[PDB]
Amino acid sequence: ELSEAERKAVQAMWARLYANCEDVGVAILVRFFVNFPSAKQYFSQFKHMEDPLEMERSPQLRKHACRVMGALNTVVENLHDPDKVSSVLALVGKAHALKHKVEPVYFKILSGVILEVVAEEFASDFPPETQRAWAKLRGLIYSHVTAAYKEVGWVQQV
């Protein structure tokens, strides 16, 4: 669950990744909405944009990219401060369960998409001990997020 080594491997990798916050977050979102056009339903601005071209460029989408990337950054950066991470995700988890009401599973799905991009950006040096280190940040994120959902006794509505 993220050694000292792992924590730095992920950290360096994301560092070079976040220095591109902009295009990378957008590529993730746009790609998430193409694979699962139904998570687009939660966004009142994309619920209808179907052409990933309109998306790719849109300043709002770019905004939600800004947010997702920023939050992840805080997690990754304070990845050694159990408390800090637990907090950013609790805050993020409850906002999505109670305010936006995104069914929890999308998180896991959205995380895979994120790693897919990471793995592509570093297809050059994506080692087993490193890919294995990202799988943790992934499982760490989700469980934390579903803990928030669980604590609020989440039920999605009809």
Per the CB < 8 A criterion, the answer to whether 142 and 108 are in contact is yes
Q: Residues near 152 by Cβ (< 8 Å), separated by ≥ 6?
A: 94, 97, 98
95 touching ligand HEM, by CB under 6 A: yes
Q: Which range binds ligand HEM by CB under 6 A, 51-59, 104-112, 128-136, 148-156?
A: 104-112
State in angstroms the smallest separation of the CB of 69 from ligand HEM: 8
72 touching ligand HEM, by CB under 6 A: yes
Is position 80 annotated in a ligand binding site? no
113 touching ligand HEM, by CB under 6 A: no
Question: Which residue, 127 or 150, is less far from ligand HEM as judged by CB?
Answer: 150
Closest to 68 measured CA to CA, from 41, 47, 89: 89
Question: Which residue, 5 or 84, is less far from ligand HEM as judged by CB?
Answer: 84
Write the Ramachandran bin of 101: left for phi over 0, alpha for psi from -120 to 50, otherwise beta.
left
Among 102, 118, 133, 148, binds ligand HEM (CB under 6 A): 102
Among 10, 13, 26, 68, binds ligand HEM (CB under 6 A): 68
Is position 64 annotated in a ligand binding site? yes
17 touching ligand HEM, by CB under 6 A: no
Tell me how many degrees the CA angle 67-142-83 measures, rounded to the nearest 5.
Answer: 75
Question: Which residue, 44 or 124, is less far from ligand HEM as judged by CB?
Answer: 44
Residue ranges that bind ligand HEM, judged by CB under 6 A: 39, 42-44, 64, 67-68, 71-72, 92, 95-96, 99-100, 102, 106-107, 110
Which residues line the annotated binding site for heme b?
A: 64, 96
